Design an enzyme around this catalytic site. Sequence first.
Site, mmCIF file in Angstrom:
data_model
loop_
_atom_site.group_PDB
_atom_site.id
_atom_site.type_symbol
_atom_site.label_atom_id
_atom_site.label_comp_id
_atom_site.label_asym_id
_atom_site.label_seq_id
_atom_site.Cartn_x
_atom_site.Cartn_y
_atom_site.Cartn_z
ATOM 1 N N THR A 198 8.656 20.754 -20.373
ATOM 2 C CA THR A 198 7.306 21.232 -20.051
ATOM 3 C C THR A 198 6.629 20.245 -19.115
ATOM 4 O OG1 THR A 198 6.396 20.296 -22.103
ATOM 5 C CG2 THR A 198 6.952 22.637 -22.119
ATOM 6 N N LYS A 215 4.060 20.737 -15.784
ATOM 7 C CA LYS A 215 2.840 19.999 -15.510
ATOM 8 C C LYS A 215 2.814 19.548 -14.071
ATOM 9 C CE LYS A 215 2.980 18.401 -20.232
ATOM 10 N NZ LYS A 215 3.296 17.207 -20.988
ATOM 11 N N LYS A 248 18.838 12.770 -20.561
ATOM 12 C CA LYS A 248 17.774 12.917 -19.562
ATOM 13 C C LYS A 248 18.121 12.159 -18.261
ATOM 14 C CE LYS A 248 14.210 13.834 -23.108
ATOM 15 N NZ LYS A 248 13.328 14.827 -22.389
#
Lengths: 807, 807
Positions: free
Chosen positions: B647, B651, B545
Amino acid sequence: QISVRGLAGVENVTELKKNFNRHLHFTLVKDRNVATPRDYYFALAHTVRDHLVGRWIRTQQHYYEKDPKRIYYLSLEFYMGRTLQNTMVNLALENACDEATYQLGLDMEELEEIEEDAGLGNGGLGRLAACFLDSMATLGLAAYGYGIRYEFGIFNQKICGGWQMEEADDWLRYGNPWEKARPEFTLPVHFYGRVEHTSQGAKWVDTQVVLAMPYDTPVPGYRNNVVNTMRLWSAKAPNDGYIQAVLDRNLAENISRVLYPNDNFFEGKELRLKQEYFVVAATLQDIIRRFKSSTNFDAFPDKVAIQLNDTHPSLAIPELMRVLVDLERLDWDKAWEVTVKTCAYTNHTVLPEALERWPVHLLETLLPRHLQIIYEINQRFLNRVAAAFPGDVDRLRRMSLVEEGAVKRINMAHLCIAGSHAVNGVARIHSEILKKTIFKDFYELEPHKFQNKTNGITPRRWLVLCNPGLAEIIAERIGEEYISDLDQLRKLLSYVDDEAFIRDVAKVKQENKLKFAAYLEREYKVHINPNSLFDVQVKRIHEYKRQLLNCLHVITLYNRIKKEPNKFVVPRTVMIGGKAAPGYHMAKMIIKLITAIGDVVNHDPVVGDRLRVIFLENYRVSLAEKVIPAADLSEQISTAGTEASGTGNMKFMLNGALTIGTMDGANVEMAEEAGEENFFIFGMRVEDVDRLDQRGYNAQEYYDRIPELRQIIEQLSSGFFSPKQPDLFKDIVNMLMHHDRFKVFADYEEYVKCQERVSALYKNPREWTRMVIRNIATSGKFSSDRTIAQYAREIWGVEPSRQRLPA
Amino acid sequence: QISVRGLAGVENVTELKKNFNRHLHFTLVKDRNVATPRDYYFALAHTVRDHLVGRWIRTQQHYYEKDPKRIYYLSLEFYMGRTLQNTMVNLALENACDEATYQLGLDMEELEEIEEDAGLGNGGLGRLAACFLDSMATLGLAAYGYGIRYEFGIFNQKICGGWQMEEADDWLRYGNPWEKARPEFTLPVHFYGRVEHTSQGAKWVDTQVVLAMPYDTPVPGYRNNVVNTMRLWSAKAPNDGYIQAVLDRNLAENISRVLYPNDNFFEGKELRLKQEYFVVAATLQDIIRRFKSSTNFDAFPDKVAIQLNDTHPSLAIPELMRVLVDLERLDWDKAWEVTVKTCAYTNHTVLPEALERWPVHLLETLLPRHLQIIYEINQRFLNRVAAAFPGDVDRLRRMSLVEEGAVKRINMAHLCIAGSHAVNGVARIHSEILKKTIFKDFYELEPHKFQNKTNGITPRRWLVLCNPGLAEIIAERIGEEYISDLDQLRKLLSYVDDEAFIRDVAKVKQENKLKFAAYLEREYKVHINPNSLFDVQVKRIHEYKRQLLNCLHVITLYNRIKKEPNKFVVPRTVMIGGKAAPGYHMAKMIIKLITAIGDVVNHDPVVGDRLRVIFLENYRVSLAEKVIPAADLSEQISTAGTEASGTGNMKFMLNGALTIGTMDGANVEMAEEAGEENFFIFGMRVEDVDRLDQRGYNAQEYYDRIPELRQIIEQLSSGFFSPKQPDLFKDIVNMLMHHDRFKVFADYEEYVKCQERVSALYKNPREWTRMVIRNIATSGKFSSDRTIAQYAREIWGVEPSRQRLPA
Ligand SMILES: O=c1[nH]c(=O)n([C@@H]2O[C@H](CO)[C@@H](O)[C@@](O)(CO)[C@H]2O)cc1F
Ligand SMILES: O=c1[nH]c(=O)n([C@@H]2O[C@H](CO)[C@@H](O)[C@@](O)(CO)[C@H]2O)cc1F
């Protein structure tokens, strides 16, 4: 239907019905098409609970405004049984709910059977605590029950091949609608650590913390709108590799997992010590918190009474010292004065193996500060003894809280006497024995501490709830007032020659026997004659209780029938029931003997239906409520001097059974109340037991002189009752012959003869019943309302009140 | 107050108030004088729950009458967060409750903050399951969520001295008003034992039994009166020395004790295998029971769909075979046809360390029959492969469900592909990568199994609930229909040049930032400039990440400020948040680096309020609902090819943040929907990563050529950020320099440059906002309603329905 069950007004029935339907929909999330009987029970239980809460909130509010002296009943056991019917009874909702559920097409009685017992006790001592809470609420005392919310109560007893099997009593599986979790009132409890001495006194440090979370259960008084509180603590780990750490939270929480199933036997296990401190540490913090919300602890004993139910919560004494001395900074002497004036201790046995004697090395690891406080208590106490009996060095070692020996132990009973302003036995003969024997030394030091408070039972559960038929015919004649003033049963003496009453009493007993006989077949496939005398012994299985003596009688009756088959005998159903502690081998063997006797006796065609021997599986409160009303004969046959009181005995007297027993425990006061002619007393008195001991008890002597006894033993030894294992019962025979502490043989002849006198009375129904009336009519003294009024006046210093609180 | 929150009619407000008062009195047993805010939250929660149950009962009734095909969503994770506000939203009760609680003198928002999150998930995959349940109910599908009721969810994260500390998430402490225990539907689950072969097939015997007890939680659809069910299983020991036996019940019950906190990492622990079988065994029995109450399993796949959320419930495949073959006596081939047609599998990663590969010796001990069924599946499958690619022996070993090596393992992903009729990735690029790389062989065998279903989020929680201000200004212009048809947001494109809308969008963002800035001080004592750009990276901490890349940018900005203090820079608040798995050392070190950077940067007087670096503690669903609406910049900077979807990204797009990211996961479809000009894309594409790998990644090269990068590394190595332990970060530097699997340095130059372009746009508020409008307006595709409609049509074979059920 029957008058004692209250009014079924149209407003109430309508209100109950819609509330039932509301709970089924909103609380249970069911509709009438998917609901089981269990859903219906819950819907009813929630509906009834709704009537409690208003009163519950106002009762606690009232105690806040008025600020009376508070009673704290500390017990490790609260043997509550079921709550639904009892709540209905005390609220006068029984007929209303009967009507309301009938109109919904349901049978209320069927729904009542679904409720699990709260079996948070072992036997007498736990059930006493339960009757007491009832009576305290009925007498309007500001009283709190404090204990442990065991996840598993007393084990369910299963019989397999005539052996006891224990299975976990998982009573919370479906939930408990009566309790309210109060996580907001959670309190820390400390364990282990070490003691540091500073300039500013001792400090207890490096402790492990276990949290105590309270659950409140309402205790409703009888028709007075008083609702008191029972607070039970649950163990919770604090929130501070990873997986294992989370799984290890169970170690802390095991504290409230399971009730120890020993009755009248001390087992020195650490987990049990943790249970004892846990309840005491959380309870005292709660007590002090409530006290501070009314600096000056002089008034503490004017605002607080703490009753210790046996020595199980005896750590309350050094714990209160610890808090007062270490945290509140009072000086020793003043803290001690407060403690003694606050605490009182109730003893329940004189058997030495039942007394709690904790190894010092346990207290040292677990509770190092409490051990220091105990040593300090012991020292100052022994200085008073030395000063009062100068030079009597043996008194000093006898009276010490510390016992010397292989392992040093603390005697918790010595601690309780020293730290309490009052010490009581639980029946007059027991209280005298405490003064003459095990606590003689303490009595000579402080005679004023020693009292008697004879046990009682609550007539709400033990008459109205379990025997409505009998309560009704009594109410017909003398009114309803006796339910909370049981002395009024005396008025029944003027009905002893009344033909209508005689017929009614007997009719009620016949109905109860019919109903119980049906229950036996429906739930346990067993065939009994309901015209036989119902001979019942129900209580925990223990050598001193002498279920074995009963066995010997039963075998005698059988041998007599086999000897003269065609001779008439009064038929009997002999029922024996009760749980044995899992590690009590002898108790387990006695259960096996009983079933083995049943295997032979119940299948002998020569015997017919003249003698049946039934072992009642899983004896517990809700089974007691069924069998007690159905009994004709109550067996209370402990060796004189061993049974502290008994309360089962009282339950039977109240419900129209006659009593065969020894002059032991409360039996003595029962016979004295009814008249000795109205009681079947047999066997050695206390004094006879003493004489036998000094001389030496030789069981061979009775075996040599009583041919009927010799035959029974020969039958046991040779395998008559265990044909596949001839020597199955060698332990029992061996014990009876060589080391019977309870002298079963010594009472055998007198017991058998007295049993013949019972059978003779049973042949004359009218005179049997007249004697029953004389028992029922004099059982008033044995109400727990009388007991608690005496505790209140002579120990706690509070006046009972029969007055209603506003509705 | 605001229109999307529904009507506050006088009848409703009055009804809510008295029901609030009813619950406070009867359910909580409190009065207004002793009630805490927690009691008020519960009273409100019970009041709202009351509105669900009618609909809940009728929804389940409807599915019984109509008997549609049922969807079973199997997941080990359901990351639900709070339920109160969401329930209000979907029921149109939000304004009504606001009014009703206001009139009782309470602030509803304050009460909402008291609800614990249901943190029964780790991150993306768990929250996907939650959004899915919402969408399934909103689309009127007869859908059930099945999982485990973990006693402890994801740990609460505490920062101490800049280090992560884990503490148990004890979310059930005060109770959960949303769940209904259903002990009556309890089911046995088997473990261990052995396999016996009889004449009548194999039999699994000598097993240990664990009971599975269900808890049902309602899932309300959006304003359609549909209420579906989430069923979570709890582990219970069966009821069959004594003390220890009772205490050992915890061993069985540990199964549902705690959620494993690994994200994107496989840990082969037995307790986790037990969790996986437990949910699968109880769920399948429930499914089959429901199926039988509608012999002929041909129709099974017409009445049942089972979705597998990753390989965690992959044992559903051999378990369904076991039941069909061993218990129902269907032949293999027919059972297999049923299984494949019933099951479908969703993959969520391509990282090899994330794939479940269970040691055979574990399956052998725990699930001996399932291992046999698996070997049999593998054999027949490999026979199809052999027949289709004759002679290709390497394909055979690559495709095997059984991996050879040091320890033999079952590849659970190979099992899922073989036993499922459909296999999907979770974004288009991810689905293509599965076909080109790890599942190439399987794709060549069965091309028709492979699908894409791009992830989505629910606009109910992720817009209406968390950002009412933005939902309102949108509703003002285009109506309310978009809440369940998010494509309608396109209509907003014709407002891109509208001066009023531009001002309103920007005003809402400013309000959200103000509110969040206040939240930072009130709850965590931290001082932030609300005029700065809010640069946020929130997600689980993982090397792929690349939170580290973000750190390097942050250090660069700081070094640039220190170099030219008096030069103007766009001020930023850089917020990074997320939990690290307890044993993921590198992840734990990255959290420490982030705080250490904050310690230096936040206290430099030369920096002023121009740069702040905040680590957001305990990132979880309810914290996401607060920070996401407040963000200006969303960081989505995974190395191309590693992030399956994301996801979080969605948002942020929905809530008016711009995105800086790589062409990875769903980012690709987001840029494609908004236009590449409306997105900040930088860095290697997938193909560039591949080229770099073939050649070899040498990080030294970037260190030698980029002076700004060299300085940062020198600062790290020499103790600039850890003055008391100069070598604290040697592991990080070492990894970056010698074994960075994720090529942080390779993207560094492009990332920094792209970040300058962001700052430039931020200087021009009007154009910043116009770009925001173009993002919000094209985020419609990313609704989980679209996702679930595609699952329903292309995998499950059911038509979604927007139609109301009667009220
Ligand atoms: O451990 C014990 N458990 C217990 O139940 N009792 C009982 O405590 C009861 C209440 O005082 C008495 O009536 C009793 O005599 C018969 O059960 C007595 O044995 C006494 C004990 F010591
Ligand atoms: O163990 C896992 N846990 C998890 O949350 N995801 C995520 O599953 C999400 C839902 O499909 C994706 O959006 C994702 O790309 C980013 O969180 C992916 O990493 C994937 C895993 F493999």
